[PDB]
Ligand binder design. Sequence first.
Ligand code: CLA
Ligand SMILES: CC1=C[C@H](O)CC(C)(C)[C@H]1/C=C/C(C)=C/C=C/C(C)=C/C=C/C=C(C)/C=C/C=C(C)/C=C/C1=C(C)C[C@H](O)CC1(C)C
Ligand SMILES: CC1=C[C@H](O)CC(C)(C)[C@H]1/C=C/C(C)=C/C=C/C(C)=C/C=C/C=C(C)/C=C/C=C(C)/C=C/C1=C(C)C[C@H](O)CC1(C)C
Ligand SMILES: CC1=C[C@H](O)CC(C)(C)[C@H]1/C=C/C(C)=C/C=C/C(C)=C/C=C/C=C(C)/C=C/C=C(C)/C=C/C1=C(C)C[C@H](O)CC1(C)C
Ligand SMILES: NCC(=O)NCC(=O)O
Lengths: 192, 192, 41, 165, 99, 219
Amino acid sequence: KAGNWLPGSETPAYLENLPASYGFDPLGLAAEPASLARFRESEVFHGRWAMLGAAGVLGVEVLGYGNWYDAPLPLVQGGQATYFGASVPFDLGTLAAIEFAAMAGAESFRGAAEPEKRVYPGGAFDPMGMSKGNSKELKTKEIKNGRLAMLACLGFAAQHAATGASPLEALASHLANPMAVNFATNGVSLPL
Amino acid sequence: KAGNWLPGSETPAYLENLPASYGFDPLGLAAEPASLARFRESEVFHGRWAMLGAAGVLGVEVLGYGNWYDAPLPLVQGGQATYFGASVPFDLGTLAAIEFAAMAGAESFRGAAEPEKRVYPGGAFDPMGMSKGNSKELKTKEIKNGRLAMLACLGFAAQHAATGASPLEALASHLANPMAVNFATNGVSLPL
Amino acid sequence: MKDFTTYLSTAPVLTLLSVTVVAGLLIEINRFFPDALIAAF
Amino acid sequence: DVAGLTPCSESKAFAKRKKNEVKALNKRLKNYEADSAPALALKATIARTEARFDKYAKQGLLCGTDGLPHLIADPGLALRYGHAGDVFIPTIGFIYFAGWLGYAGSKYLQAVAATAKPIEKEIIIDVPLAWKLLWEGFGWPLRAFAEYKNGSLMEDDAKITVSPR
Amino acid sequence: LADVNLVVGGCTVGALALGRFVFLPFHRASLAKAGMPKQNGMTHLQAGDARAEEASFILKTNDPAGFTVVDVMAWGALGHAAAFYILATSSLGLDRNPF
Amino acid sequence: ATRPLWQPGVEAPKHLDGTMPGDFGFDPLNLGVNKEALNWYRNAELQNGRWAMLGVAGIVIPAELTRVGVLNVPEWAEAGKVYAESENAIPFASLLMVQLFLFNFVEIKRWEDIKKPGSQAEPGSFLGFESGFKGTGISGYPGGAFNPFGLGNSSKEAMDDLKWREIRNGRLAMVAFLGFLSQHAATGKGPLDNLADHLADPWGANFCSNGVSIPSALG
Ligand code: CLA
Ligand SMILES: CC1=C[C@H](O)CC(C)(C)[C@H]1/C=C/C(C)=C/C=C/C(C)=C/C=C/C=C(C)/C=C/C=C(C)/C=C/C1=C(C)C[C@H](O)CC1(C)C
Ligand SMILES: CC1=C[C@H](O)CC(C)(C)[C@H]1/C=C/C(C)=C/C=C/C(C)=C/C=C/C=C(C)/C=C/C=C(C)/C=C/C1=C(C)C[C@H](O)CC1(C)C
Ligand SMILES: CC1=C[C@H](O)CC(C)(C)[C@H]1/C=C/C(C)=C/C=C/C(C)=C/C=C/C=C(C)/C=C/C=C(C)/C=C/C1=C(C)C[C@H](O)CC1(C)C
Ligand SMILES: NCC(=O)NCC(=O)O
């Protein structure tokens, strides 16, 4: 296990050998084997997408190209989307088309495989061969970093929907005045 | 079967071995064998025709040649309808006559064939030799796409009869502000 | 008494009594709430 | 307005009818000392007539070419025009009370059928039982729909006697 | 409203060809299913209506597909009716369009 | 069986045994003689009670919190129009259709529960979530994903006790909501307004003084 979520407790029996398992299942969602066998792959994929998303949200702002929210504004407004500074002359419809074609073929190729190959495909997805050499610890690494990134992406969306600022802008506004610039101070999150 | 449209329910027994069956028959319209055979043929043929129809309705508009409703108007009140931007030198009378002759020949040849060869006649209608490698699965895909396309064509008709727009225009209008321009906002669908 | 109440339960008397009660009730309702053409609530 | 019928509160013929009927009663008044029993009766009648004509105008009933209130008997074309109290609401009210009486009688029949002398318990009613069932009949929509969904409301025709074709 | 000759001739020839080549299998199948009319289980000929005796000039033909003269006349009648629908409708010049 | 009844001295009907939670032998109209109808009525009472508890909470708690000086939300009757006049307000028809479209899915799921109380737990129904719909052997008490804290999920008789508490509170809430509706129809004031009004003059300000309860024609 390594973890107990609630320090004292009794944890679900089916959660024991999984990578980065803390017995977190008070709802009994993965009790049957098939539900858990699907939810593991769903969580890993969710974590990878989150890690990449959080990387993008930090990178689009830390380097100096704007928010993670204003990203799609130059898509309408007449036209013209910016990527590092290029024009990428591609209207809205062709973006949806090209991305739909790419994600359809990719997601229809990665899923049509066996359950283990659906989440942990060695093949060319381990070019540096770190898939071997005791991959349980590395799987724990991946899953925990993915959980952190999921919460990070959720926080990005929520703090934008509350204060309207930006990750780095919100961080700066908090660090300047930790005292009256919290979630408790904007009259959205904490109401009382 | 694979599916049950009302998960916790019991399905009719005559709907099991059929491809793309979900037990969906609340009116018992297939309670008789010969009736169900005719219905199966008619469903597949309707699916094919509606796939062609939906593809045409979308491809005349995404390619940019007017919408499906105003395509036959120029033939009346003038003449020489346009295809790909060209102009056929045919009137409504000769169009109706040529279509009647050709469709009569085609559907008279189809209708005189064997029961199964009236709906799945591979022969020269499968040049790419795809009916092999267990067509059952392929039949299910064809039926489900046909069901989707049939519902889409009926949707084209009803949406144009209610709002008077065009498929992509209605799509864009709903996407712009869904919570206030769905079907519940026009004065037709909802008698309020 | 028991036979008198049995007589009061006979169809000729109980029917007439119930018609009298319902008639009186409609007459009272129309006396207090007259000229009501619609169910105005 | 629902079909060329202006609200009685607007129709001039409706007010004219009010006027004429009141004027007739005034002419009947002008013969008695306004403190005698006939005079009090006439004054009460006039007050009742005025109250009725004001009540009808308040509720927005529709008057025709003549000054007489009209009613609407189509749900939807009366619900989107504020005239559901004309036929639809009294429809519900009747259907309810009629069903109440019918269900009370039906259950009384089914209760006294399973007794010693069922032909006797129809001419000499059991008043406590009749009254109990009359009280239970108020929930008749619920109980009747329960018996229909149960199949115990009706009887299969294989058990009902029929004529020789 | 453009040449009675062309429209009526083309329509009639097309209808003849359509009833000889295209609709003939279904026509013959339906005719074989239906059959001669029967009263009380016997044809009108067996019952004694010797005028209901089948016309002799249709039982055997010389068309390799069995296209009799009466078939020709029925299909030509349909063709002429359709052709004159075409003519009479194109001859009018009024807005019937519900738009 | 020997439990307290709605009327002490009047015996309970021989169909309202003593097993259902909230059973006080109250059934003067004999609506629940049929067993299947009794199950459907039990389930209906649960739904009405739960929705009435939610509604009466969302009526009094905002009202009392407004009274003391917080949140200053309108009174429940006009709260529909107060939102409806807002700028970016969803139109009523579209809003009602959104609500009805969501509740269609949810309530047909609960319905298929009510028929066979294990209906929605068949594998392949949802996307792995179908296990949380297994039910608890009685309709109206799903458990699983519902009841996250596992309250009463221990001693059986503990669950029986909480069931009586729930049903009593729900019955109180429905009676109170009927009270709110009838009070606002009569006196165009709020619930706490009526409460603070009655305590002022209990013999003068009541239901026999608003003039809408007792018909003015009679008096
Ligand atoms: C409670 C008794 C009862 C019940 C449940 C019914 C029910 C029914 N009757 Mg019926 N009927 C009854 C008594 C009853 N009737 C009596 C006493 C007579 C003799 C006058 C008739 C003569 C009669 C005829 C001629 C017809 C029906 C028909 C019908 C059916 C159509 C509904 C209708 O509108 O009928 C109409 C109702 C009446 C014409 C008169 C109703 C009599 C009173 C109002 C009810 C009696 C209540 C009872 C005396 C009180 C007992 C209460 C208890 C506490 C003691 C329906 C199933 C029609 C049918 O054929 O079905 C389609 C039909 O044509 N009935
Ligand atoms: C476990 C459990 C179990 C038990 O039994 C019960 C309970 C307790 C309930 C539970 C819980 C759970 C949870 C918590 C969940 C959550 C999740 C999440 C948050 C996800 C995220 C998720 C998220 C994610 C992926 C993310 C996404 C995003 C992304 C990618 C990004 C995008 C982008 C970018 C790049 C940039 C640009 O410029 C913008 C955009 C375009 C926008
Ligand atoms: C199954 C069942 C059974 C149970 O038991 C009961 C119930 C429930 C009743 C059921 C259901 C039903 C349903 C849903 C139905 C529907 C159908 C449809 C939608 C059809 C359509 C169908 C449809 C279709 C085919 C369509 C087709 C189309 C087309 C050709 C088109 C053409 C065109 C185009 C291209 C375009 C142009 O510009 C014009 C035109 C020329 C016009
Ligand atoms: C038991 C029995 C049996 C025997 O045998 C017979 C008899 C006697 C008949 C009986 C009795 C009965 C009764 C008493 C009943 C009653 C009921 C009720 C009241 C219900 C309610 C019920 C109620 C309910 C659900 C309610 C609900 C509510 C709600 C949602 C609310 C909502 C809302 C809110 C929040 C606020 C806003 O601003 C407005 C609104 C929107 C409005
Ligand atoms: N047989 C396909 C399958 O197992 N799919 C699982 C998923 O939805 O990821």
